[PDB]
Every structure is written in C-alpha cells, then in structure tokens.
C-alpha cells in the first residue's frame, strides 16, 4: 500500500496473509472456513494467517491454518487477468473473535465516488522496495468506468474496476494482491493488477467481487 498509514492493531479483522514460507499475497475471510483471494496468487500449498497485524512477530492472536482446498476461478485468464479470483477452504474453522472475523459479500456493484478501505502488507514505495511489518491501510474512491477505460484502454473487462487517484501517489502494490477493497462494510474488490504502483493516470485495477457472488455460493455449496 503506497501512500497509506499503519492500520490500528487488528482494525481489519477480515484481512489475511497468505504464506508459502513468506508473505506473498493477501486475502479476505468471508466465512468461518473460506477466504477469497486473487487467481494469480494461486499455489498448490498455502498457509492462511489470520489475526495478523505485524507479520514478522508472533503477537499471540494469530491463527495459522493450512489451505485444504485451493480453487482458482476455472476461467481465470493469466494473460488478461479476467476472472482474477480464487477461493480457499481452510482445513479448520477460523475461531471468530475480536481480531478475526468475516467480511460480507457485496449486495450491489461498486458505486462511483464511494470511499473504500484497501489493506495489505505490500510495498509502500512507488519506486524501489520498502516492505512493511505492520498492516497498511488506505482510503480511496471508486473511479468511473470511463476513467478506468481511459487509463487502460482495451484492458478492462466488466469484471474489473478502478479504485484510486489519477494524480498518483496512493495505490495498492506488490504484496497486496488478493487483499480486500471494502466499501460501507462490504467486500467490493480483490487487489488484482496495475501498471506500476501509484503512477499518474494508473490507478489499481480490482476484481469486481459482486460478479462472482453466485460462483462463490456454488463453489462453497459444492465443497461443504
């Protein structure tokens, strides 16, 4: 998260870290056994880390739960990043408490101008590398489709949207993929891609969670 601030300790209780020996992506806990993340965060083995704030330090609230199933969207397209979404079923239930809880699924598509919170342990530098220990937060608005399209002509599908600032300086970055974009207590996005981080006229592109509601219901059902 470039241009963000330390989130208060455990103020984003739905945020997860995905770990393969080190933190590689984010995710969102959407029920006691399921996490949503991006498709390009796929790996065949993943440890899900919930209730984290500082990913370097065992604070005493963390639950470290293996991924029992890892189900990328079957029409995920590695070249265009269309359908950049993935579900992870945890091997056990997350213990819901004050540092770990779920975020609701969206009930309507993102609405332009809405102020959203984006979170992650990704790079905080727009050039070079400054990866933080503490979870980073950033307030940013949903951009119109016209702006999104002008920023990435021919590259935006109806499954993507843009959140951020055309003037640059504030954006999600490497290490933030899969994490949440949350607006008025609903999960509207998954950090997906962009041209650089925090560059002018290049806001982050985010997967449009609302479009995957049914797929998520059905995948959950078929694996319950």
């Amino acid at each position: 998260i470039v241009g963000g601030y330390n989130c208060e300790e455990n103020s984003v209780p739905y945020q997860v870290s995905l770990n393969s020996g080190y933190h590689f992506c984010g995710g969102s806990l959407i029920n006691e056994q399921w996490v949503v993340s991006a498709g390009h965060c796929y790996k065949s083995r993943i440890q899900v880390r919930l209730g984290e704030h500082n990913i370097e330090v065992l604070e005493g609230n963390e639950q470290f739960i293996n991924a029992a199933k890892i189900i990328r969207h079957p029409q995920y397209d590695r070249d265009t990043l269309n359908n950049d979404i993935m579900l992870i079923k945890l091997s056990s239930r997350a213990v819901i408490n004050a540092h770990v809880s779920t975020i609701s699924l969206p009930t309507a598509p993102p609405a332009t101008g809405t102020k959203c919170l984006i979170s992650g342990w990704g790079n905080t530098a727009s050039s070079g590398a400054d990866y933080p220990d503490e979870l980073q937060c950033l307030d940013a608005p949903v951009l119109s489709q016209a702006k999104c399209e002008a920023s990435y002509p021919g590259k935006i599908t109806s499954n993507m949207f843009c959140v951020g600032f055309l003037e640059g300086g504030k954006d999600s970055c490497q290490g933030d993929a899969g994490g949440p974009v949350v607006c008025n207590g609903q999960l509207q996005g998954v950090v997906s891609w962009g041209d650089g981080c925090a560059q002018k006229n290049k806001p982050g592109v985010y997967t449009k969670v609302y479009n995957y509601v049914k797929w998520i219901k059905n995948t959950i059902a078929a694996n319950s």
Binding site: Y22, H23, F24, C25, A38, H40, C41, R78, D79, L81, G122, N123, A129, Y131, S172, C173, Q174, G175, D176, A177, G178, V191, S192, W193, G194, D195, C197, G204
Partner: protein, 55 residues
C-alpha cells in the same frame, strides 16, 4: 550465457510478492527480486540453482 540473462528483472503488472531469481550481469550472480505473478520474462527463475545453471 543466453542473451536473455542480460535483461533487467521484470516485476510485471500483477501484485503478488513472489520471490524469484534473476541473473544480474554486472554483478555476475543470481539475485533475488519481487515478481508480481504474471507476465514473466525469461530472466526469472524459481530457484538460485536454475538461475546459476542457465546464466
């Protein structure tokens, strides 16, 4: 040394943080960098040993 070993490392547009290896030509060794998750160029290896072998 294939000529692709001379490319700067390429993060790509995806926002994962995947530790990969690349040949740094000047420094004459395999080094770590952050790969974003999609659109890999060839100077991008999954271990140091692979990198050292090709480059």
């Amino acid at each position: 040394r294939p000529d692709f070993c001379l490319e700067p490392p390429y993060t790509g547009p995806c926002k994962a943080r995947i530790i990969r290896y690349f040949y740094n030509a000047k420094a004459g060794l395999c080094q770590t960098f952050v790969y974003g998750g999609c659109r890999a160029k060839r100077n991008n290896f999954k271990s140091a040993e692979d990198c050292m072998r090709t480059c």
